[PDB]
Design a protein around this nucleic acid. Structure first.
Ligand SMILES: [Mg+2]
Ligand SMILES: [Mg+2]
Ligand SMILES: [Mg+2]
Ligand SMILES: [Mg+2]
Ligand SMILES: [Mg+2]
Ligand SMILES: [Mg+2]
Ligand SMILES: [Mg+2]
Ligand SMILES: [Mg+2]
Ligand SMILES: [Mg+2]
Ligand SMILES: [Mg+2]
Ligand SMILES: [Mg+2]
Ligand SMILES: [Mg+2]
Ligand SMILES: [Mg+2]
Ligand SMILES: [Mg+2]
Ligand SMILES: [Mg+2]
Ligand SMILES: [Mg+2]
Ligand SMILES: [Mg+2]
Ligand SMILES: [Mg+2]
Ligand SMILES: [Mg+2]
Ligand SMILES: [Mg+2]
Ligand SMILES: [Mg+2]
Ligand SMILES: [Mg+2]
Ligand SMILES: [Mg+2]
Ligand SMILES: [Mg+2]
Ligand SMILES: [Mg+2]
Ligand SMILES: [Mg+2]
Ligand SMILES: [Mg+2]
Ligand SMILES: [Mg+2]
Ligand SMILES: [Mg+2]
Ligand SMILES: [Mg+2]
Ligand SMILES: [Mg+2]
Ligand SMILES: [Mg+2]
Ligand SMILES: [Mg+2]
Ligand SMILES: [Mg+2]
Ligand SMILES: [Mg+2]
Ligand SMILES: [Mg+2]
Ligand SMILES: [Mg+2]
Ligand SMILES: [Mg+2]
Ligand SMILES: [Mg+2]
Ligand SMILES: [Mg+2]
Ligand SMILES: [Mg+2]
Ligand SMILES: [Mg+2]
Ligand SMILES: [Mg+2]
Ligand SMILES: [Mg+2]
Ligand SMILES: [Mg+2]
Ligand SMILES: [Mg+2]
Ligand SMILES: [Mg+2]
Ligand SMILES: [Mg+2]
Ligand SMILES: [Mg+2]
Ligand SMILES: [Mg+2]
Ligand SMILES: [Mg+2]
Ligand SMILES: [Mg+2]
Ligand SMILES: [Mg+2]
Ligand SMILES: [Mg+2]
Ligand SMILES: [Mg+2]
Ligand SMILES: [Mg+2]
Ligand SMILES: [Mg+2]
Ligand SMILES: [Mg+2]
Ligand SMILES: [Mg+2]
Ligand SMILES: [Mg+2]
Ligand SMILES: [Mg+2]
Ligand SMILES: [Mg+2]
Ligand SMILES: [Mg+2]
Ligand SMILES: [Mg+2]
Ligand SMILES: [Mg+2]
Ligand SMILES: [Mg+2]
Ligand SMILES: [Mg+2]
Ligand SMILES: [Mg+2]
Ligand SMILES: [Mg+2]
Ligand SMILES: [Mg+2]
Ligand SMILES: [Mg+2]
Ligand SMILES: [Mg+2]
Ligand SMILES: [Mg+2]
Ligand SMILES: [Mg+2]
Ligand SMILES: [Mg+2]
Ligand SMILES: [Mg+2]
Ligand SMILES: [Mg+2]
Ligand SMILES: [Mg+2]
Ligand SMILES: [Mg+2]
Ligand SMILES: [Mg+2]
Ligand SMILES: [Mg+2]
Ligand SMILES: [Zn+2]
Lengths: 99, 100, 138, 125, 208, 84
RNA sequence: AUGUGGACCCGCCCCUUGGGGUGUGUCCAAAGGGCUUUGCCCGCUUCCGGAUGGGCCCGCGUCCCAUCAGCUAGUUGGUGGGGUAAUGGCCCACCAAGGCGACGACGGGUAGCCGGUCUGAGAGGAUGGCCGGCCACAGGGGCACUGAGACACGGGCCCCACUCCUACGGGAGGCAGCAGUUAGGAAUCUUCCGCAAUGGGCGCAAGCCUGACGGAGCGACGCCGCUUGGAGGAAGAAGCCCUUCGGGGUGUAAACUCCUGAACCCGGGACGAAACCCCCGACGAGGGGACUGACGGUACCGGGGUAAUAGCGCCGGCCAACUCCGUGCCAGCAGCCGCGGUAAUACGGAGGGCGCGAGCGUUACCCGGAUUCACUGGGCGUAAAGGGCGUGUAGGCGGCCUGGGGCGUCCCAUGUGA
């Protein structure tokens, strides 16, 4: 009785979860780095931000996040984590930052 | 080109923001008499220098805020509380139009 | 007080003419002047003379007319059949060089203030200007 | 006035009141006859003009004139309203079209049959 | 379609012979000769002074009744004329005269414009070699109107074509009588025919 | 992609295209960016084809894409004949 | 994993509102399928351009009622955040108390806006229907997903209203797509043909889909073109009208005589179609070669060939067209002025006449005439119109001379004005 390209929606369902799943990981990881960069642990912090950075762009290639959004994320991120580690912290690694 | 306008400040009472009063002269579409008008603008003063009377210029800019899309250009003729008074009495007289 | 002096001039004349007099005195200006002038240059008037009256300057304007007609009312034709202010303080009249009068089919003459001064319809067209139409005369 | 005033108010734009409001920008409007009777016109003359009171679509009930000589309209008779007063009879502002719905044309009328809803008669045989 | 029926009532009514029949409207008796008074019961009665409107009216109809066309087709030409250059009025006659069926009357292929039309309509007439059956054709300079082949003969043409030997056809006209063909040469100035009409009034009329 | 194609004009049974540039998702009589000549597919006139052949290649340069029945009327205008 | 190259933080560099350049650190790429296969082709991934299509913002313009005169809590600004392709009070905190309005806010009524369109001498006035550009909606609402792109007519979830199916065991639908039905209404069509052409989607391409479109169908709804004939034909029959009974009219009208010949019958028969593809050349440039027409056996061409529908309005004045009869303020007409009371050119019929003609009238509405909202282009002693009289706020207007500025105004050039 109808168009069988309703798949186009059923297709969306996968693309929905798939790109949704990655997207939760992005933030829950992004979570970590922030808390850590606030408690001096600039070591384990920039291990995550380095992981954060990769998590984003890796989805950016695909159809999830795109454009200046990764940039907008990553910016305000290392625009912040570093601006936390100013609380002594000591740049345990430039392993994220062109310090 | 970005619009260029010239007017008087009537409000400094916003933080780092001001209100510029712009006039324009032109003839009436049907009756040709040359007439004036006014529009207020909310001008950006990110270093609250400009103040009451500052006959100044402003320029169309990216949306600083709602209602607020003009940055100040430059002072032209500071101290003009005489023009300001016109805006003031006019708004004052409004009270004596209160439908009572 | 006089809201409009230029009108007052024209009107002073128009009043004077309708009783057929020699002269017509009127308060002085450098802008009333180069407005008259044409009226002599186009020979609507004899002409004038800057004079003073009671210590105060005026412009005795000398009136032309025509032939002592005959029949009842021998009063001659006027030179100035008609004259009226156009642009006024109540409503200023400006025109591009295109939008410009054909007063009484060439027989009449407009008078206008322009970027070169007190031209006429004919002149302002040829200089290519137009401006504040003062008045029309015939 | 003066020119200043003209900016302050302008000139007012007259407007135009209809004289056939029962129709609503319609050429016509179908209705149903309530009363069918005769009335006396303005002193000017005198007679017994046939008018119907018509309840139409829009709940409206207006007096409509019945023209020509005789008709076929009792009470409950579907009708069609035209537009155009009578002048003699005050209050009436509408005519009835003939030969449409329950109102029929004028019998044995030979001239202005365009009105009077009268079909063309046979002349030869 | 066109007017059909009583014609001679119209050489009259208008009160002026307008040669609308074949030879009759040219023979001693053109609906006017015998009875040069308006048609109907009220014929031999003294006219009352016309209205200015009435005067203008009669003048228009006359002209139209001469060329014999619908009021439809007629007025288009007036407005067309009314729109054009300079005189934007008197030119009118030029547009009327460019009508195929009109020309054919002048070219003496027929005698009544009514007869002319039935030819064009039956397509016994050709233009520049083209079977043209449309009495409204605005012909122009140098266009050529000739009898087609299936009809070069025909009793009705020959005598109608023959009797033309006598008169100087219009300045704007030309005719190979033997060759059965003519040329629209030019636009007939107002001069080129003093019609019994005062076209000034037709203008005056149509600006109601 | 942007395109070059046949935009119908004229009348019923009296075709009279207008050769033109627009978006492939515009209407076939919709708004265009630039007209480049006409085409009566009924050869009812000498001037029954015309191109501004410079512009034609210009849009073709930047990335226009004519139709399987628009190139034919541009191939027939030496747009492709590319010298030696 | 590779990194041309790109992104992010800090630096200086230039430039300048997050533009460009670079330094270091750290993150990012993937794809194969088909062969005239060993070479090419269709695809893949990063970056910069181009072009096209947009998003957001700004100035000016855009209806009626002041018998709506005061409005405002995300209200206004700030700071910092959240969010987006990105600005922003867009959302969220916190801080400040601002923001708007007689130049008409707020409220109410109506409306999709424009190119255009109608009228008008113009200035205007009126209007937005087909066509084109943009906005908005897809039963009423809300929401997000996928995606370059939507919050999506013929995709999805939820609520409501409504209708339908069912062994009732429960589920289903969204014509404002094309036709078509119903209801409402004074009123608006075929449940047609074809992708032949144009355009669009997919594919290397054949080819496929296309109620876009190209045609056909219905409706005098409009514009246009054409027919119901032409020449002849009487001092001018009959019938019908008047009649001062002498006559006049219809009327060259008919008849009648010649001529042509709409229709219809026969034959022929399109344009609209040239490319995609195919050959050689490298499938490119090139010549060249080939298939396909829904409309349709249609228009048009030839021959044959028949005198073949006319109606509607008006005929007191304005306003063109007049006489008998009937009627007797009755029956009736009417756009206004008004006609009918036993002699009606005004009713009704008739003869005749005027006016258009497959049309003629009517009603409704817009503009004109109306210079009767008057800018162009009007008035206020008695015709409608001077505030009962002051003082005065905003506002409008402003004398004589010389400078600077050149806002208005004026000129030129240029872009734009689809
Ligand atoms: Mg997305
Ligand atoms: Mg009476
Ligand atoms: Mg009486
Ligand atoms: Mg009548
Ligand atoms: Mg002219
Ligand atoms: Mg588009
Ligand atoms: Mg080709
Ligand atoms: Mg990798
Ligand atoms: Mg940079
Ligand atoms: Mg991939
Ligand atoms: Mg395989
Ligand atoms: Mg887009
Ligand atoms: Mg808050
Ligand atoms: Mg903030
Ligand atoms: Mg922000
Ligand atoms: Mg988006
Ligand atoms: Mg304002
Ligand atoms: Mg108001
Ligand atoms: Mg509302
Ligand atoms: Mg609406
Ligand atoms: Mg408009
Ligand atoms: Mg016009
Ligand atoms: Mg016009
Ligand atoms: Mg206008
Ligand atoms: Mg409008
Ligand atoms: Mg409408
Ligand atoms: Mg529509
Ligand atoms: Mg549209
Ligand atoms: Mg519905
Ligand atoms: Mg959809
Ligand atoms: Mg939806
Ligand atoms: Mg939408
Ligand atoms: Mg649907
Ligand atoms: Mg439908
Ligand atoms: Mg119904
Ligand atoms: Mg329907
Ligand atoms: Mg249709
Ligand atoms: Mg197709
Ligand atoms: Mg195609
Ligand atoms: Mg393809
Ligand atoms: Mg295949
Ligand atoms: Mg299908
Ligand atoms: Mg189909
Ligand atoms: Mg169609
Ligand atoms: Mg038809
Ligand atoms: Mg009808
Ligand atoms: Mg007789
Ligand atoms: Mg007789
Ligand atoms: Mg005859
Ligand atoms: Mg024969
Ligand atoms: Mg054949
Ligand atoms: Mg094909
Ligand atoms: Mg080729
Ligand atoms: Mg070939
Ligand atoms: Mg056949
Ligand atoms: Mg034949
Ligand atoms: Mg017959
Ligand atoms: Mg006959
Ligand atoms: Mg009439
Ligand atoms: Mg009339
Ligand atoms: Mg009369
Ligand atoms: Mg008698
Ligand atoms: Mg009697
Ligand atoms: Mg009588
Ligand atoms: Mg009497
Ligand atoms: Mg009458
Ligand atoms: Mg009568
Ligand atoms: Mg009769
Ligand atoms: Mg009659
Ligand atoms: Mg005035
Ligand atoms: Mg008056
Ligand atoms: Mg006064
Ligand atoms: Mg009185
Ligand atoms: Mg009075
Ligand atoms: Mg007084
Ligand atoms: Mg007072
Ligand atoms: Mg009082
Ligand atoms: Mg004052
Ligand atoms: Mg002043
Ligand atoms: Mg001054
Ligand atoms: Mg320009
Ligand atoms: Zn005759």
């Amino acid at each position: 009785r109808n168009l069988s390209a309703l798949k186009r929606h059923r297709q969306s369902l996968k693309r929905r979860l798939r790109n949704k799943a990655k997207k939760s990981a992005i933030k829950t990881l992004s979570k970590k780095a922030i808390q850590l960069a606030q408690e001096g642990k600039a070591e384990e912090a920039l291990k995550i931000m380095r992981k954060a950075e990769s998590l984003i762009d890796k989805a950016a290639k695909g159809s999830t996040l795109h454009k200046n959004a990764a940039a907008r994320r990553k910016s305000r991120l290392m625009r912040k984590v570093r601006q936390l580690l100013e609380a002594a912290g000591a740049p345990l690694i430039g392993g994220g930052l062109s310090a | 080109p970005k619009k260029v306008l010239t007017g008087v400040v009537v409000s400094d009472k916003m933080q780092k923001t001001v209100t510029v009063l712009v006039e324009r002269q032109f003839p009436h579409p049907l009756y040709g008499k040359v007439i004036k008008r006014s529009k207020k603008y909310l001008a950006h003063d990110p270093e609250e220098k400009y103040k009451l009377g500052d006959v100044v210029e402003i320029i169309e800019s990216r949306p600083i805020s709602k209602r607020k899309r003009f940055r100040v250009l430059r002072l032209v003729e500071s101290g003009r509380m005489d023009l300001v008074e016109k805006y003031l009495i006019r708004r004052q007289n409004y009270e004596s139009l209160s439908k009572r | 007080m006089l809201t409009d002096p230029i009108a007052d001039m024209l009107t002073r004349i128009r009043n004077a003419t309708r009783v057929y007099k020699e002269s017509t005195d009127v308060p002085a200006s450098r802008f009333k002047e180069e407005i008259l002038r044409i009226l002599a240059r186009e020979g609507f008037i004899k002409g004038y003379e800057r004079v003073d009256v009671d210590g105060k300057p005026y412009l005795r304007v000398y009136l032309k007319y025509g032939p002592r007609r005959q029949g009842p009312d021998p009063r001659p034709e006027q030179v100035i059949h008609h004259i009226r202010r156009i642009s006024k303080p109540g409503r200023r009249v400006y025109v591009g060089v295109k939008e410009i009068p054909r007063v009484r089919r060439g027989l009449g003459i407009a008078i206008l203030s322009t970027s070169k001064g007190v031209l006429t319809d004919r002149e302002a067209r040829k200089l290519g200007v137009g401006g504040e139409l003062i008045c029309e005369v015939w | 006035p003066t020119i200043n005033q003209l900016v302050r108010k302008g000139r007012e734009k007259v407007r135009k009141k209809s004289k056939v409001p029962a129709l609503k920008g319609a050429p016509f409007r179908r209705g149903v006859c309530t009363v069918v009777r005769t009335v006396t016109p303005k002193k000017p003359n005198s007679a017994l003009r046939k008018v119907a009171k018509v309840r139409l679509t829009s709940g409206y009930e207006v007096t409509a004139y019945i023209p020509g000589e005789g008709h076929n309209l009792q009470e409950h008779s579907v009708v069609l309203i035209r537009g155009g007063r009578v002048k003699d009879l005050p209050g009436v502002r509408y005519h009835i079209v003939r030969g449409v719905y329950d109102a029929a044309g004028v019998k044995d009328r030979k001239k202005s049959r365009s009105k009077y809803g009268t079909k063309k008669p046979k002349e030869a045989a | 379609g066109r007017y059909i029926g009583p014609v001679c009532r119209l050489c009259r009514r208008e009160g002026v012979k307008l040669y609308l029949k074949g030879e009759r409207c040219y023979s001693p008796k053109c609906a006017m000769e015998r009875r040069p008074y308006p048609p109907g019961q009220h014929g031999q009665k003294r006219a009352r002074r016309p209205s200015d409107y009435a005067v203008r009216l009669r003048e228009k109809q006359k002209l139209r009744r001469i060329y014999g066309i619908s009021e439809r087709q007629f007025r288009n030409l007036f407005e067309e004329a009314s729109k054009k250059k300079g005189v934007t009025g008197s030119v009118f006659l030029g547009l009327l005269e460019s009508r195929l069926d009109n020309v054919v009357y002048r070219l003496g292929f027929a005698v009544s414009r009514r007869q002319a039309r039935q030819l064009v309509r039956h397509g016994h007439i050709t233009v520049n070699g083209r079977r043209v059956d449309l009495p409204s054709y605005r012909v122009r300079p140098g266009d050529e109107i000739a009898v087609a082949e299936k009809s070069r003969n025909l009793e009705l043409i020959r005598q109608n074509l023959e009797a033309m030997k006598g008169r100087k056809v219009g300045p704007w006209l030309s005719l190979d009588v033997e060759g059965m063909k003519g040329k629209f040469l030019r636009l007939p100035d107002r001069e080129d025919l003093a019609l019994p009409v005062n076209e000034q009034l037709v203008i005056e009329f149509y600006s109601r | 992609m942007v395109k070059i194609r046949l935009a119908r004009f004229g009348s019923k049974h009296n075709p009279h295209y207008r050769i033109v540039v627009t978006d492939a998702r515009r209407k076939r009589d919709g708004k265009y960016i630039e007209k480049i000549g006409y085409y009566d597919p009924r050869k009812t006139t000498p001037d029954w084809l015309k191109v501004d052949v410079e512009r034609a290649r210009y849009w073709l340069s930047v990335g226009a894409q004519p139709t399987d029945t628009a190139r034919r009327l541009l191939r027939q205008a030496g747009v492709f004949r590319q010298e030696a």
